[PDB]
Amino acid sequence: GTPVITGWSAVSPYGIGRAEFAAGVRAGAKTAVKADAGLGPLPSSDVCTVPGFDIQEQLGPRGTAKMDRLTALALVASDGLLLDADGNRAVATDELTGVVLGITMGSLENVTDFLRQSYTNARPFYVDAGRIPFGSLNHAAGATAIRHDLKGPNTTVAGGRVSGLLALNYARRLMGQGRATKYLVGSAEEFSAAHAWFEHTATASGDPAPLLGEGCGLFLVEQAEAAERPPLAAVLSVETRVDIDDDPGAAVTACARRALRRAGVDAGEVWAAVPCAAPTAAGRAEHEALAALVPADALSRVPSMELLGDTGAASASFQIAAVLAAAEADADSRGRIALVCAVDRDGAVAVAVLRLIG
Amino acid sequence: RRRVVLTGFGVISSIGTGVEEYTAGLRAGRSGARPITRFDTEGFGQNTACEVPDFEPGRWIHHVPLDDMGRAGQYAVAAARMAVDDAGLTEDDLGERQAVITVGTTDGESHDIAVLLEQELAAGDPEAMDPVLARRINAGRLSTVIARELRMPNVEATTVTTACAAGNYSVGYGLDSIRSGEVDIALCGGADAVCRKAFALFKRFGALTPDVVRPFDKDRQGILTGEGAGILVLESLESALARGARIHAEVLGYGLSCDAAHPTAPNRDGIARGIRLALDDAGVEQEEIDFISAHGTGTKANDKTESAAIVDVYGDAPPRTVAVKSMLGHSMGAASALGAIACGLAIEHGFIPPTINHRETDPDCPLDVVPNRAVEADVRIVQNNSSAFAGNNAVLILGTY
C-alpha cells in the first residue's frame, strides 16, 4: 500500500504544462519580466509570472470574468494532469478520487479588493458581489472538483512553502484509511500586488524586495498495487516539525534524519536533494543543513529553481516536479532516493523521501 | 483497527470559556448574541454578532508573545492550553510525543488584513503597513503557534482551510492520523475571529438575520457571525488507558464528500453522501443515532437542503436534529469543532442541547429540533454535520466509550 505518483502537471513562470516546466528547469531559463503597469505600483518591477496566461483565453467565457488567478492556475494545472494536449481524457477519476491543494492565504487580491470596496464605497458591504464565491480559501480545490466532477474528498490546507508536502502527507494518510483510491495533490500561489506588498512588509527590516513567482504543481497519486499507470516515484516518508527554537538548520536536519530513518534509507543513498531555497536566512540555513547531511552530488543533481523567484505555496510542488523531470531525463534515476524539503516563515518544516521508479 | 478517544476539550465561545461554562451554556440555551466591539459597524444598518465577550489571553498563553498572533491564533492557542489541561497532559507529557496539530479556519486573521489595508488607505502608502501584522496573517500560523506554546517540535502543523466545515475536517484528520498508527495524539479543532470581511460578506449575500438566529424556524432570516475556538485532544485508546486518562467520548468515524456542483449553495445529494460515508466509517446504522448536531445555520437555503438530506438518509424517521448555531451564531471554521465538543458533552452528560429562538418549525423540515430548552436523554451516538462553500461536506460520528 505505498503511495506512488503516476502523473504530474505544472503551470509556472516557465509556461503552461509539464513539458515547458521540464525544459525551463533543464535550460536554467530566466523567467523574470517587467510587471504589467496594470498591476499598479509594486515593491519590485521584476516578477516571475506565468507567461502568456490569460484566464478567459485558457478557461473560456463562462464564470471566468471575476475568477481569481489562484483558481485559474489550479484549473489549468488540473487539465494538464487529467487531460492530454488535445483535451482527451488521460486519467479515469470517480467518487474515490480525492483533491487536496496547499495554499498560503488563498487570493489576497480577492480579499483586499473586497475590503478596499468595503472601506471606500457608499456603504461597507457595497462590494463586487460576483467576486464573493472566489474569495473562499477552498475555492480553487472546489472549482477543480466542479470542473472534473470529483465528488470525493475535497480538502485545502495552508502552510505556505510546506503546504505541498502537508497536502501530500494528508493524501497519503486518507488513502491509507481507504477514503480515496486516487488523489490530485499539489499547491498553488497567485502573483498579486496585495501579496507582493504583504511579503515586502513581512520580510526582515531592510531585506531586498524579493523576486516573486507563482503557479501550481499537481500530482496524481495512486496505491502501488492498484496503479492504472507506471509509477514515477514511491512516497516512502513525509516528516514534519515545527521550528520552535528559531533554529531552522537544526529543525531541517532533525526532520530530514527522521524522514530518511522512516524511509529505511541512509543519507548516503540520496541521489537528488531539492531544498525550497527561500530567499531568507532560514532558506540559507536549510541549504547549509542539507549540504552537510546528503552527498554534495545530490544538491547539484537538479538544476536550481532560483530563477522562478519565490513561488510561495507552489514551492514544494515545483520541487517534486523538478525531481520527476530530472528522474525522467536520467535512466540511472531508477530505484534511487530523492529528498525534497521546505521551511515556511510560520515555523513548519517538512521533508519528503521518494524512491524514483519511472 | 485502532480506537480513538476524546480526553480533553478546550473552549473559547460566545456562551462560555472552559468546559464547565460551555456545558452550562449549552444546557441553559444561552445566547451568544451581543453588540460588535471588534470593528466599526457604521453603515451596515445592524451591529450584532456572537463575539467572545471577555477574552483574557494572559490567563492561557505563557510562551508565545501575543503580538505574534491575531485574535484567531490567540483563541486557538488558549483553547489548546485548556484542552491539554482538561486531558491532564503537561508540556512535559507532550514534548517528545509525535503529534498532529490541525486547526480549521474560514478567515484566519482577516481582521488583521483589514487593519493593514486601513494603514495603507490612511497613508495612501503601502510602506505605512505594520510588519508585526503582516507577519501573522497566514493561516498556517494558527497550527504552528500551538506547537510553539506547548513546546512540541515533533508536530505536523496543518491548518485546514475548508471554510465552514474546517473543524470537522481537522478532527477527522486527527482520527485518520491516529488510526494510521503513526501518532497516538492529535490536537484538532477550529478557530476564527469576528471581522469586517465575514460581516460584510454575509450582509451582501442577504444571509444576516436582522434580529436572532432561528434555525429550522418557518420565518428564519439567516445567521449572526461568530468566533472562538474549539480544540479537542484525540488519543489512541491504548495511550489514554496506559496513562489513566479520563475519556469524554469515542471518535467512531467521519465522512468527506464534495458536491462538485456549486461554489456557495448547499447540495442535498452531497450532504446525504457525507452522512452515509460517516455512518459507514463509524460502523453504525441510522437507527443507532440518538441525535444530529446540524450545520443548521438558519438561512432559508441551508436548513431546507440539510433537512431534505437528513430525511433522505434516515428514511422519514430522522432523529432529533438540533442547531448549536442558534446559541453560538456561525463561528465559521470553529463552528464544527464547537459542535463536536457539544456532541461529546451531550454523550458524557446525557442531554441534548436546544435549538433556541424557535417559534414554529418549518413544515418542510419535519424534525424535532428540541426547541428552546435542553432535554435529558440517553445519548450514546451523535452525528455532527458541517457544510461549506466550494461544496465541502464533513460529517463526524462520536460515541460513548
From TrEMBL, chain A:
GO biological process: fatty acid biosynthetic process
Short name of any one Pfam family annotated for the protein: ketoacyl-synt
UniProt keyword list: Transferase
InterPro entries: Beta-ketoacyl_synthase, Ketoacyl_synth_N, Thiolase-like
Highest taxon of source: Bacteria
All residue ranges annotated as the Beta-ketoacyl synthase-like N-terminal domain in the record: 4-226
GO MF terms held by the record: 3-oxoacyl-[acyl-carrier-protein] synthase activity
Protein name per the record: Ketosynthase
Gene name linked to the record: iga12
TrEMBL record, chain B:
Enzyme class name: transferase
GO-annotated molecular function: 3-oxoacyl-[acyl-carrier-protein] synthase activity
Gene Ontology biological-process annotations: fatty acid biosynthetic process
Cellular component GO terms, alphabetical: cytosol
Keyword terms of this UniProt record: Acyltransferase, Cytoplasm, Transferase
Name of one Pfam family that matches: ketoacyl-synt
Cellular localization per UniProt: Cytoplasm
Catalytic activity: a fatty acyl-[ACP] + malonyl-[ACP] + H(+) = a 3-oxoacyl-[ACP] + holo-[ACP] + CO2; (3Z)-decenoyl-[ACP] + malonyl-[ACP] + H(+) = 3-oxo-(5Z)-dodecenoyl-[ACP] + holo-[ACP] + CO2
EC number: 2.3.1.41
Xref: InterPro entries: Beta-ketoacyl_synthase, Ketoacyl_synth_C, Ketoacyl_synth_N, PKS_Beta-ketoAc_synthase_dom, Thiolase-like
Domain Ketosynthase family 3 (KS3), first and last residues per copy: 1-400
Subunit structure: Homodimer.
UniProt similarity note: Belongs to the thiolase-like superfamily. Beta-ketoacyl-ACP synthases family.
Name of the protein this chain belongs to: 3-oxoacyl-[acyl-carrier-protein] synthase 1
Organism: Streptomyces sp. MSC090213JE08
